[PDB]
Structure 1
Amino acid sequence: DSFVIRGDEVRQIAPGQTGKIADYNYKLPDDFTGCVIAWNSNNLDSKVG
């Protein structure tokens, strides 16, 4: 699963986590097994306007 989120919301991508994005956008199971990879993309996903 791949997507782009805000910098402060990466901590919400984790099992048993509550927040604006975990509740309404993307929810992880409590028995989740696997890996989470996240890196900054301020070079491609930023525009002056």
Structure 2
Amino acid sequence: APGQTGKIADYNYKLPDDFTGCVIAWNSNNLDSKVGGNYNYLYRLFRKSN
């Protein structure tokens, strides 16, 4: 959301302070639950800047 910082807020993907739109979140624990541990979902860690 515009107004948060963290691994999920800036280190991966940022929302602008003048953003207008709609975020959508829903429970995809059915398909995403992979017996293989679904480790194909990555993200950059702690980038030196924002």
TM-score normalised by length of structure 1: 0.63
Tell me how many residue pairs correspond in the alignment: 36
Higher RCO (C-alpha under 8 Å, 6+ residues apart): 2
* Percentage of matched positions with identical amino acids: 100
Pairwise CA distance, 1:33: 0.3
The structure that has the greater radius of gyration is 2
TM-score normalised by length of structure 2: 0.62
Distance in 2 of aligned mates of 1:37 and 1:23: 18
Q: Which runs of 5+ in 1 are unaligned?
A: 1-13
Q: Which runs of 5+ in 2 are unaligned?
A: 37-50
Q: Compare the two structures and name the one with the higher helix fraction.
A: 1
